Every structure is written in C-alpha cells, then in structure tokens.
Paper text:
Forty-two different mutations in the PrP gene (PRNP) were identified to cause a variety of genetic prion diseases, including genetic Creutzfeldt-Jakob disease (CJD), Gerstmann-Sträussler-Scheinker disease, and fatal familial insomnia. Most of the mutations do not cause large conformational changes in PrPC, whose structure features a folded C-terminal globular domain containing three α helices and two very short antiparallel β sheets accompanied by a largely disordered N-terminal tail. Here, we report the cryo–electron microscopy structure of an amyloid fibril formed by full-length human PrP with E196K mutation, a genetic Creutzfeldt-Jakob disease–related mutation.
The subunits in each E196K protofibril stack along the fibril axis with a helical rise of 4.82 Å and twist of −0.68°, and the subunits in two protofibrils stack along the fibril axis with a helical rise of 2.41 Å. The E196K fibril core features a compact fold containing a long β strand (β1) and four short β strands (β2 to β5). Four pairs of amino acids (Lys194 and Glu207; Lys196 and Glu200; Glu200 and Lys196; and Glu207 and Lys194) from opposing subunits of the E196K fibril formed four strong intermolecular salt bridges, with a distance of 3.1, 3.4, 3.4, and 3.0 Å, respectively, and Glu207 and Arg208 from the same subunit of the E196K fibril formed two weak salt bridges, with a distance of 6.3 Å, to stabilize the mixed hydrophilic and hydrophobic protofibril interface.
Numbering used by the authors:
A (entry chain E), B (entry chain F), C (entry chain D), D (entry chain C), E (entry chain B), F (entry chain A): 175 to 217
C-alpha cells in the first residue's frame, strides 16, 4: 500500500521599479476560494 | 499497490519597470475557485 | 501502509523601488478562503 | 477693452460597488502634464 | 480695460462599497505636473 | 483697469464602506508638483 509524495519549487526573482505616478507590480500570486488540498491519501 | 508522486518547478524571473502614469505588471499568477487538488490516492 | 510526505520551497528575492507618487509592490502572495489542507492521511 | 469670463460645472454622481476580488472604480478624473491655463487676458 | 472672472462648481456625490478582498474607489481626482494657473490678467 | 475675481465650489458628499480585507476609498483629491497659482493680476 506504499505511497510517496515529493514536490520541490525554488522561486528566484528580483524586481525593481521607479514609478512616476502609479504602479502595482504584484509578483507571483494565487488565490483559491474553497480550496481543499491533500496529499498521499489511502482511504 | 505502490504509487509515486513527484513534481518540481523552478521559476526564475526578473522584472523591471519605470512608469510615467500607470502600470500593473502582475507576474505568474493563478486562481481556482472551487479547487480540490489531491495526489497519490489509493481509495 | 507506509506513506511519505516531503516538500521544499526556497524563495530568494530582492525588490527595490523609488516612487514619486504611488506604488504598491506586493511580492509573492496568496489567499485561500475556506482552505482545508492536509498531508499523509491514511483514514 | 471689456472682457468677461464665466464657467459653471455641476457634477452630480453616485457610485456603488460590491467587489469579490478586485475593483478600481475611478470616477471623473484628469491629468495635464505641463498645463498652463489662463483666463481673460488682455496683454 | 475692465475684465471679469467667475466660475462655480458644485459637486454632489455619494459613494458606497462593501469589498471582499480588494477595492480602490477613487472619486473625482486630478493631477497637473508643472501647472501654472492664472485668472484675469491685464499685463 | 478694473478686474474682478470670484469662484465658489460647494462639495457635498457621503461615503460609507464595510470592508472584508482591503479597501482604499480616497475621495476628491488632487496634486500639483510645481504649482504656481495666481488671481487678478495687473502687472
């Protein structure tokens, strides 16, 4: 009944901004309303 | 009944902006309303 | 009934900004309304 | 050399919003970079 | 050399908002970088 | 060399907000960098 579960995620980044009136600059983003996340289930 | 589950995701990036009145610049983004994510299930 | 659960995430970043009236600059962000997260379940 | 200068501007409005994740709703707006406005000149 | 200068501006408004995550709602707004405004000049 | 200078501006408003995470709601606003405003000049 053996399972296994692995996940790697390296996220390198470098932002820069010089605004003159308006700027938002939202980097990597998510949103999940009724999220139900799981992993390695053996019901 | 053996399973296995692997997933890697490296995400290198470098943004830059010099606005003069309006700018948004949203990098890698997602959204999932009623998300139900799983992995390595053996019901 | 053996399981296993691993996940690594290194997140290097370096932001900089010199505004002249408005700027937001929100780096990596998420939001999950009715989140129910789990890991390595063997019900 | 008589002049005259009149200008009226009534601006009635009524906004409303019920957001669920993003909304801007900028009402009557302007912007003028090197503006040089005058009135009733008799050089 | 007579001049005259008049200007009226009544601005009635009524905003309302019920946000659920993000909202800006900027009402009547302006911006003028190197503005030089005058009135009733007789150089 | 007679001049005259008049300007009236009544500004009635009524805002209201019930936020659930973020909200800005900036009412009538301006900004003028190198502003040089005058009135009724007879150089």
């Amino acid at each position: 009944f053996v399972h296994d579960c692995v996940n790697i995620t390296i996220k390198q980044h470098t932002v820069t901004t010089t605004t003159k009136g308006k700027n938002f600059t939202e980097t990597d983003v998510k949103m999940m309303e009724r999220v139900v996340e799981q992993m390695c289930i053996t019901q």
